[PDB]
Amino acid sequence: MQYKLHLHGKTLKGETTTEAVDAATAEHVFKHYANDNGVDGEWTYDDATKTFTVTE
């Protein structure tokens, strides 16, 4: 299943996706991706849109 990530950092904004078995594991993948790209902030998830958000 596909899950989305919305990045809202001061130096990086946009969207990516990942294919994971469930949302909980998609979360950790995204959190790593955010971290490897210098985005550190508050995380929320919205199941209706299958979308994670990280905000700096």
> What does the domain layout of the chain look like in residue ranges?
1-56
Under 8 Å between Cβ of 7 and 17: no
According to CATH, the topology of domain 1-56 is Ubiquitin-like (UB roll) (3.10.20)
* CA quadruple 34, 45, 26, 43: dihedral sign: positive
What resolution in Å is listed for this PDB structure? 2.2
The DSSP symbol for 50 reads: T
Under 8 Å between Cβ of 54 and 30: yes
Q: Tokens 């899950």 sit at which residue? A: 3
Alpha helices in the chain (DSSP H): 23-36
Method of determination is X-ray
- Residues near 24 by Cβ (< 8 Å), separated by ≥ 6? none
Q: Which long-range contacts (CB under 8 A, 24 or more apart) does 27-34 make?
A: 27/52, 30/3, 30/5, 30/54, 33/5, 34/5, 34/7, 34/9
Distance, in Å, from the CA atom of 55 to the CA atom of 31, rounded to the nearest integer, reads: 12
